[PDB]
Design a protein around this ligand. Structure first.
Ligand code: 07N
Ligand code: MG
Ligand code: MG
Length: 194
């Protein structure tokens, strides 16, 4: 329990104690804000010149999956924490703290790295699970029903409106929204402004 790891746990406690101060509310608006917090990272990575595709999927039981083709969150052991950079970044994430479960897959160094968390707490050390010829970041998360008491069900039209807006505002980025909650009836909208 180093000073860094203690700071992490205190940070998770603070976010879960007063979630509304971080994401505005714990209502339906707050639930959808989780998606924008993650997608904003991918947008910045695109604007920095390293990504051009973002995919948002509403998966079974209202998991959200966000994928980009950026550089991938770094996995090198950093100086401050002595932990992989990706773990440090995600253990300070408000979305992670307010999710009952969160998973990351980083495609980087021709390797796929995986870590999972519950309420921000890593469930195991970052591990290599496969290989890849792509780079990018995949985040899957399930909003915490203890925090989001009114609803944990996403509204497709709400996500659609803002995703369309984000593509219009950030030209060149292909942004795709897909609803896979009903496997028999799957909806997809893909936006790409020139
Ligand atoms: C979905 C998603 N995507 C990103 C993301 O793309 N983050 C970038 C990845 C590249 N970064 C690098 N930092 C240092 C790098 C290096 O090579 O040293 S690459 C900056 C952000 F972390 C994040 Cl964070 C999330 Cl969450
Ligand atoms: Mg960033
Ligand atoms: Mg493009």
């Amino acid at each position: 329990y180093g000073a860094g790891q203690i700071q992490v746990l205190e940070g998770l406690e603070a976010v879960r104690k007063r979630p509304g101060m971080y994401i505005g509310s714990t209502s339906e608006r707050g639930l959808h804000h989780l998606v924008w917090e993650i997608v904003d990272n991918s947008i910045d990575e695109a604007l920095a010149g390293y990504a051009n595709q973002i995919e948002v999927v509403i998966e079974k039981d209202n998991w959200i999956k966000v994928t980009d083709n950026g550089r991938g969150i770094p996995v090198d052991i950093q100086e401050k924490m002595g932990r992989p950079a990706v773990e440090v970044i995600l253990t300070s994430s408000v979305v992670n703290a307010l999710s009952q479960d969160l998973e990351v897959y980083v495609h980087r160094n021709e390797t796929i790295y995986h870590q999972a968390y519950k309420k921000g707490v890593p469930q195991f050390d970052l591990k290599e699970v496969g290989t890849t010829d792509k780079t990018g970041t995949v985040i899957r998360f399930k909003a915490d029903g203890e925090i989001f008491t009114e609803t944990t069900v996403y509204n497709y039209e709400t996500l659609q409106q803002r995703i369309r807006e984000l593509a219009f505002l950030n030209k060149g980025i292909q942004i795709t929204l897909r609803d896979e909650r009903d496997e028999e009836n799957v909806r997809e909208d893909s936006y790409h402004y020139e």
